[PDB]
Amino acid sequence: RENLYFDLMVTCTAPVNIAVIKYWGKRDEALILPINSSLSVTLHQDQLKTTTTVAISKDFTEDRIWLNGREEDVGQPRLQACLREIRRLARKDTLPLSLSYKVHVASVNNFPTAAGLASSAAGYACLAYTLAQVYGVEGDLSEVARRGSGSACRSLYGGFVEWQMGEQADGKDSIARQIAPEWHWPQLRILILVVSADKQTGSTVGMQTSVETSTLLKFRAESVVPERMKEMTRCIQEQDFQGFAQLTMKDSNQFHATCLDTFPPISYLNDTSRRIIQLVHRFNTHHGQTKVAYTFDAGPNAVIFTLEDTVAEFVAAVRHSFPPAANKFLKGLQVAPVLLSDELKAALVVEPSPGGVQYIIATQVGPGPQVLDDTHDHLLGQDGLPQ
Amino acid sequence: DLMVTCTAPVNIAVIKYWGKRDEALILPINSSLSVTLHQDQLKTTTTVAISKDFTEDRIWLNGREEDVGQPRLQACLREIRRLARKRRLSLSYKVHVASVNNFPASSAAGYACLAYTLAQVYGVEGDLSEVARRGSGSACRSLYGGFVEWQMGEQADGKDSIARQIAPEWHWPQLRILILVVSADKKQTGSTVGMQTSVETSTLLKFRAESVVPERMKEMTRCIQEQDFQGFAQLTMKDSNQFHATCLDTFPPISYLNDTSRRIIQLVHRFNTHHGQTKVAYTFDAGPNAVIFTLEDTVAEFVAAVRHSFPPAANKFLKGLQVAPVLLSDELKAALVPSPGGVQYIIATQVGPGPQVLDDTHDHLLGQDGLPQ
């Protein structure tokens, strides 16, 4: 039977990432090419992860996709571009047989919806990576992930990751690369403060309105970001927390400034976001040092960076300024509670905001996508349908 | 022994002043352009009395005595007294000054009124921009009626950093202004200290002042000259958002708009979309209150929309100019949002004249003794 000339199911996981130098605005809407480079921190899959199973079989009648147990239209443009690009690269042996088969894709994630995380970024990084497994595609997959969602390319790598905007109109150099591994800065901690607040402007549609109407955005991309990429890279390389934190806050605030300069304006921060920002600055002022950073994506949730040794105290300050309407306040990494000094208490807001923060997801820097090797991990049954 | 009482208007910048190039002389990083609001609805009243009997300068605001040694107050008094001698006993007289206003802008009308009233008492003729500006930068814009530019000036001595009227108050008689006073909120950074932080830390601010505002001044001027409401409206909203963007880009950031401001912004865009044209514009100063510009024929409808989206708390919602109420169409209601008591009340007004000397029909804010009555 070895003398004759010539199904597969693979399940992978992928991380979410948080941009510290923000992507906002495309120079090419079709190829998903950005007006500036971006830089993010990959969060640990121990706490947050997308899982995707890809099966191919000679028996599958059609291409079919599910997200969190619900079937979605296989024909979505971003999804079609992703699949087209992985097939292109694979061609760029069982391979032809493999390609002849319809695909069945099923994915899930463990992100609370209120968490407002980039499910799309992790989702397309996982899709690209799992398709690459199925089709035996070696080398960088940025071009595949990016077509699904721009920032998805940054979830292809662990640690600290840059998406290089690229110079080429075909997008071949618009790719992600690791700046430093997830073991580079083990003391770094990330706290996602999920706020009680809500339909936000879609970031795809929104950022294109900004490209069209914000003059500050153009100045930002042309004259600010390239040099910021370099400073932020150096802070990360040097484990310079104060430099990292200051640049992180500034680039977040600048991004939201360009949203406000958009016509009509886009506003993601709310009054709770603004109270979190004030808490962060007050906490730092009390310590006389930059101990904590915030950054905000396309919504009001605050993403906090701090060092392991500051986590307990800062969580106590959050509880003080936003007395929680839950006893389960801290999800993910646990730290023993600590009491705030009288001096810090009086430096914080006199009138707190009970329930402003729904809960905190506590996590750390983590690895890139991973292949799962357990039979039971597959989100599709033998039939190639969800279980 | 002379007592004079004048009033001065508030003004709303449509091309925003934000950031000084010279903190001492109060010279701005860009020119600004404002609409003078009518003193029949909003005004500062100031009485100045001059006498041999007064041993020291004394000043009251809204019934409360204030420290005359305030740097801005001293700068204003110094400049007027310098000019008083130039035009010419009384150059050595001390003054008692009392002012009141009907406000929820304030320092602009306050210093425009002080400069104007001191000029009356001291007999000072000609442009008072520099006197008012030294008290508060935007105060020079309240010296003229209608549509007024504060020209940033090219001279280091600041003598050409002055206000000039672009068009008089009768130029665009259909224009109306609604101030939406939002429910009380905690006060964010003061604007003098705040804008200086922006000069020190915002890169977007430098680009704005150098590369955006000079062109917008010209575009705005043209829209005003042509009574082009849609052009005027779009620029007004854009420049307000840009101003607040540079605040967000400051380190640490300054955020004057709140969730209510945000909801008013969304009401304006939805209202305009429903109508298929720009009917209404917003602009915000250094706080969450919305200033709305619209034409006379749209006021009633828009007031009804505000009422709908922000149901008033139970206890007169429309102050100032009165317009008969209308009901919103089902189509518009459906297109809008709501927030109960978000808006405390609305002040409606129109474009108005510069400062005015009051006749003796009105009582002075000081009695015969030169003290508040």
- With CB atoms and an 8 Å threshold, state whether A250 touches B251: yes
Which residue has tokens 């750390």?
A364
- With CB atoms and an 8 Å threshold, state whether A263 touches B255: no
Show the tokens assigned to B269: 């865009």
Give residue B252's Cα distance to chain centre.
26
Any A CB within 8 A of B270 CB? no
- With CB atoms and an 8 Å threshold, state whether A250 touches B245: no
Residue A96's φ and ψ, nearest 5 degrees, are -60, -40
Q: Nearest chain A Cα to B288, which residue?
A: A271
Residue A77's φ and ψ, nearest 5 degrees, are -60, -45
Cβ–Cβ under 8 Å, residues B78 and B30: no
Q: Nearest chain B Cα to A275, which residue?
A: B255
Question: CA torsion, points A207, A210, A216, A217, in degrees to nearest 10?
Answer: 30
DSSP state of A198: -
DSSP state of A106: E
Q: Is cis: bond before A112, omega within 30 of 0?
A: no
**Long-range own/partner contacts, residues A298-301 (CB < 8 A, 24 or more apart):** A298/A116, A298/A200, A298/A201, A298/A203, A298/A206, A298/A268, A299/A116, A299/A200, A299/A268, A300/A116, A300/A195, A300/A197, A300/A268, A300/A269, A300/A270, A300/A272, A300/A273, A301/A115, A301/A116, A301/A192, A301/A193, A301/A194, A301/A195, A301/A273
Q: Nearest chain B Cα to A284, which residue?
A: B252
Method of determination is X-ray
Which residue has tokens 């665009």?
B172
Show the tokens assigned to B361: 């029909």
Residue B181's φ and ψ, nearest 5 degrees, are -90, 115
Cβ–Cβ under 8 Å, residues A35 and A242: no
Nearest CA to A32 out of A148, A121, A139, A122 is that of: A148
Instruction: Using DSSP bridges, classify how beta strands B163-167 and B94-101 pair: parallel, antiparallel or unpaired.
Output: unpaired
Cβ–Cβ under 8 Å, residues A166 and A32: no
Cβ–Cβ under 8 Å, residues B307 and B339: no
What is the spatial distance between Cα A365 and Cα A129, in angstroms, rounded to a whole number?
A: 20
Q: In one letter, which amino acid is B288?
A: P
Show the tokens assigned to A216: 């500050």
A70 among annotated binding-site residues? no
Instruction: Using DSSP bridges, classify how beta strands B147-150 and B32-36 pair: parallel, antiparallel or unpaired.
Output: antiparallel
- With CB atoms and an 8 Å threshold, state whether B241 touches A223: no
Any B CB within 8 A of A263 CB? yes
Q: In one letter, which amino acid is B219?
A: E
Any A CB within 8 A of B258 CB? yes
Looking at domain B168-358, its CATH architecture is 2-Layer Sandwich (3.30)
Any A CB within 8 A of B181 CB? no
Residues in contact with B302: Cβ distance below 8 Å, sequence separation at least 6, in sequence order: B178, B271, B279, B280, B292, B294
Show the tokens assigned to B284: 């915000």
Nearest CA to A210 out of A17, A35, A33 is that of: A35
Any A CB within 8 A of B234 CB? yes
What is the spatial distance between Cα A158 and Cα A366, in angstroms, rounded to a whole number?
A: 6
- B203: chain A residues, CB-CB within 8 Å: 219, 223-224, 254
Q: How far is A206 from chain B (nearest CA, A)?
A: 15
The answer as to CATH 3.40.47.10 being correct for domain B1-167+359-373 is no
Cβ–Cβ under 8 Å, residues B94 and B56: yes
How many contacts (CB atoms, under 8 Å) link A and B?
Answer: 71
What is the spatial distance between Cα A375 and Cα B5, in angstroms, rounded to a whole number?
A: 89
Nearest CA to A141 out of A103, A95, A182, A174 is that of: A174
A150 among annotated binding-site residues? yes
- B257: chain A residues, CB-CB within 8 Å: 267
With DSSP H G I counted as helix, E B as strand and the rest as coil, what are the percentages for chain A, rounded to 5? 40, 25, 40
* Domain range summary for chain B, segments of one domain joined by +: 1-167+359-373, 168-358
- With CB atoms and an 8 Å threshold, state whether A223 touches B211: no
**Listed resolution, Å:** 1.9
CATH placement of domain A181-372: 3.30.70.890
Which residue has tokens 């994506």?
A297
User: Looking at the partner chain, which of B242, B248, B258 has a beta carbon nearest the beta carbon of A271?
Assistant: B258
Residue B341's Cβ-count burial label (10 Å; 0-12, 13-18, 19+) is middle
Show the tokens assigned to B245: 């963007």
Residues in contact with B326: Cβ distance below 8 Å, sequence separation at least 6, in sequence order: B300, B301, B304
**DSSP assignment string, A37-86:** -EEEEEBPTTTS-EEEEEEE-TT--S-EEEETTEEE-TT-HHHHHHHHHH
A259 among annotated binding-site residues? no
Which CA distances in Å does A54 have to A12, A136, A247, A367? Answer: 9, 13, 39, 21
Any B CB within 8 A of A217 CB? no
DSSP state of A339: P
Binding-site residues from annotation of B for (R)-5-diphosphomevalonate: 17-20, 72, 136-141, 192
What is the spatial distance between Cα B121 and Cα B100, in angstroms, rounded to a whole number?
A: 18
Cβ–Cβ under 8 Å, residues A297 and A118: yes
Cβ–Cβ under 8 Å, residues B198 and B246: yes
Any B CB within 8 A of A252 CB? no
Q: Nearest chain B Cα to A251, which residue?
A: B249
Which CA distances in Å does B90 have to B16, B50, B56, B121, B159? Answer: 39, 8, 14, 10, 26
A206 among annotated binding-site residues? no
Cβ–Cβ under 8 Å, residues B87 and B124: yes
Residues in contact with A183: Cβ distance below 8 Å, sequence separation at least 6, in sequence order: A159
Helix (H, G, I), strand (E, B) or coil at B345: strand
Give residue B230's Cα distance to chain centre.
22
Which residue has tokens 């801005």?
B72
What is the spatial distance between Cα B296 and Cα B322, in angstroms, rounded to a whole number?
A: 11
Any B CB within 8 A of A228 CB? no
Q: How far is A290 from chain B (nearest CA, A)?
A: 12
Any B CB within 8 A of A3 CB? no
User: Looking at the partner chain, which of A265, A271, A281 has a beta carbon nearest the beta carbon of B265?
Assistant: A265
Q: Nearest chain A Cα to B186, which residue?
A: A351
The kind and range of the H/E element at A286 are helix A271-287
CATH placement of domain A1-180+373-387: 3.30.230.10
